[PDB]
Design a protein around this ligand. Sequence first.
Ligand SMILES: CC1=C(/C=C/C(C)=C/C=C/C(C)=C/C=C/C=C(C)/C=C/C=C(C)/C=C/C2=C(C)C(=O)CCC2(C)C)C(C)(C)CCC1=O
Length: 309
Amino acid sequence: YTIESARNIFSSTQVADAVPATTAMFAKLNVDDQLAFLWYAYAELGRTITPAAPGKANLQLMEGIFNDIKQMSHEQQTQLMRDLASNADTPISRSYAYFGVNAKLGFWWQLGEWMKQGIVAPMPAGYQMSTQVKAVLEAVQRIDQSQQITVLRNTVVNMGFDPSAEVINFKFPRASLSPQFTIEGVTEPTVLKYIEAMNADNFEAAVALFANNGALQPPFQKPIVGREAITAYLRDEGQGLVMKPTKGVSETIEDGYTQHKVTGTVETPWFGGNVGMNIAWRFLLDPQGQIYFVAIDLLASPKELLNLT
Ligand SMILES: CC1=C(/C=C/C(C)=C/C=C/C(C)=C/C=C/C=C(C)/C=C/C=C(C)/C=C/C2=C(C)C(=O)CCC2(C)C)C(C)(C)CCC1=O
């Protein structure tokens, strides 16, 4: 077995292809229209769901930058939004590039609030009734909420400077009591211990279960190899996630390796159970019961939760 061949481990599982397709569409817009799409897509989403406050302590990690953006002309604030959206090399764009996913999301969230108060100039958006942006809007609204918030996350993860260590990491309260999940059809300790570690916010215990040369493939992303790179990834994107697998199958294969497919929902700290992402986990364990490979898939539809062999 090789990482390349373990990527195919249950090949019938079907994924939300519309996510990268819709990001590719957003990429074809000019900056004026990328901003107009962000403003409207967020306002439209805010008809059903509003992201939860990320915390005073988390947002205090960027207090310096927030003070700058407040002691700044409406014209300066406008220019910053354009600079972040256009991938410009300015001081705050360079800083933004060292925010982790949640800090980037939190940066935008805290500006949203001050927009409501007039303390920050709104989105300086080109027109949102532009045909090009109206078409990318239609594509977003045609897909489920888990896909919409994923598209919205991607466009925000891709703003500011592109520099090819010092990443700001939001931390969040553990959600609930000891049994946060129960998996029908899977008692494999390594699988259970992974989900327990993630829900406990203990990413060292989660990565401890990986082989020295093991890998983690996030949704729509390349595999991440070895405990150091996996642990750094998870210290960013794993924070505040609650993982609610409910069913799966275990299979022994060649050389005393085992395969496991587990399905359920994942809840972001931002939306809680308002957006239950339908997720599969595909694990290849070597004979020592260690994780050689695990893929995480945003599933195509709720029907995929029941596709198990
Ligand atoms: C932009 C903007 C604004 C605001 C914009 C705002 C506030 C936008 C807010 C958007 C937010 C908060 C979206 C968040 C998305 C979260 C996702 C998709 C996470 C999924 C994680 C998963 C599946 C994790 C899975 C995983 C599992 C299960 C593992 O087991 C392994 C790890 C892994 C992590 C991979 C304004 C307010 C200013 C208006 C205009 C404007 O410009």
